[PDB]
Amino acid sequence: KFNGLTVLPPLLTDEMIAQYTSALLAGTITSGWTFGAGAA
């Protein structure tokens, strides 16, 4: 492949994607749908 081809990194690391799924999940468990409509 090493002849003109390159792969760029994603903007969010898999550690940062897992911090988002954690925050969505922790909001969902502690506050229901309310964190989608406003403050948790």
Partner 1 sequence: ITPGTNTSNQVAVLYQGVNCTEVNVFQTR
Residues in contact with partner 1 by CB under 8 A are 6, 8-9
Q: Minimum CB separation from partner 1 for residue 22, in Å?
A: 22
CB 31 within 8 A of CB 23: no
Look up residue 40 and give its two tokens: 């948790």
**Cβ-contact 38, 27 below 8 angstroms:** no
Query: Measured from the CB of residue 6, what is the shortest distance to partner 1 in angstroms?
Result: 6
d(C-alpha 40, C-alpha 30), whole Å: 8
We find the least distance from the C-beta atom of residue 13 to partner 1, in angstroms, to be 8
Using the minimum distance from each CB to partner 1, give the nearer residue, 13 or 34: 13
